Design a protein around this ligand. Sequence first.
Ligand code: ZN
Ligand code: ZN
Ligand code: ZN
Lengths: 258, 258
Amino acid sequence: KTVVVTTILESPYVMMKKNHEMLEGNERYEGYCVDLAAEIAKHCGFKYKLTIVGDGKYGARDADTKIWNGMVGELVYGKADIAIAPLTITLVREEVIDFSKPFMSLGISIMIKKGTPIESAEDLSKQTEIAYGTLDSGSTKEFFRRSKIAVFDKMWTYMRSAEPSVFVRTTAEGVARVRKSKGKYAYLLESTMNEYIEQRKPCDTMKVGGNLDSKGYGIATPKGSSLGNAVNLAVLKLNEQGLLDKLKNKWWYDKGEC
Amino acid sequence: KTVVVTTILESPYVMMKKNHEMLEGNERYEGYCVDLAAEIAKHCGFKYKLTIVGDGKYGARDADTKIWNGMVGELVYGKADIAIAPLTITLVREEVIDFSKPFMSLGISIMIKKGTPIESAEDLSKQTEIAYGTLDSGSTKEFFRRSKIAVFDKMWTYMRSAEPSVFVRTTAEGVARVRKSKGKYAYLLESTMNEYIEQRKPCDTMKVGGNLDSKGYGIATPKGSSLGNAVNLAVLKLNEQGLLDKLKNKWWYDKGEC
Ligand SMILES: [Zn+2]
Ligand SMILES: [Zn+2]
Ligand SMILES: [Zn+2]
């Protein structure tokens, strides 16, 4: 039967085509993950339907109810068969769902509006004129919340209490905030996205400093899924075939407008 | 009871302590993987014995023999319970053994003697005065042998037929060859090793160009091993806590000699 793929609208991973209104099904979308999903479905020989996660989140566990939201939740509760998106491989998630070996390597990075007096995380933690935050319900927020290293811990103390809130619902919201904040806001996001945005108009942002950590994105399946094994080998095969690198250049720099 | 850990003598992952002759068991060794093995064992709750792979190889399957050698072979045939070393996660290997999520991210790179007129793989492929090769029985050689992209295919065509052999039995042998060839030999090895050597006296080598691919190292266990699950969670836990980054700084740069 048709495999239900959950994903999220996040450029350049998954975006609606210009003429999506006249298109149907999987044809309505384009992007790195759209291409990746097609490659995987072909090598594993299955039909699939791309669906956009209902709450538009990656996935976090509610501390009160212990209920998972986002794409992780759709997998945990049987609403989806596989997640193909820029979903970060983490311990808390690995405990409830399965991840293939990473199809992309990245790390948390700093996005500033061009000209802002910031070059590192240490620089952000020593000032208060410039606010900074992260995406909600994801791995980046968890990183700071659970960090015991001096600089990041102090950053979390500031962010978790900040008012107004420095957290955002979507990457787009964080990027917009940096751009319209005259440089009084810095956004903490994964290098993959930072590098992508840095190459798009109005070309007013830039990634500064080195990554804060090293991790990766994996294709996720529910625990005990029959697709788990196959997808994992498919990812490795595609990386060694050079496909993943091919797709990276196609959506990041071949389309770059800066 | 005691878990047999197979590893390889590869600096700075595993090395004999200066006074190993007067030490016993695991205390005889030191290095990144020795430090990592101790942590993995503590977190998974098991006692272990470090052993150096008999043939000093990482692992490849003999074409006609069909027998796996190196650390992979030790796991495949039941001589070791786990491998903790800079062992690359690859498709052919994941087909016979299990790998944890990566504990280190790296890629194939080029090592030259300082002053060598080479800036990239494309440069090596378009000339013939400078010879170049890779390590034997490993993922790097397999990368070129299977590559379908023009530049690497061209490089493989040359390397596979070059005489005398451009391949080496150990990383140390390749590094020595670069150092003694007066710029007439370039070595293809993983970025991790390239970066390490670049910081070792006589500081006469350097890493040039970007990485050729993107992959990682994983802790390997025999397929279906009962240690697999715990080890994987341990790796994720340790990466998130910053131990892996702390360990790389300790063995790579804190001890740099250049
Ligand atoms: Zn394909
Ligand atoms: Zn709640
Ligand atoms: Zn520990």
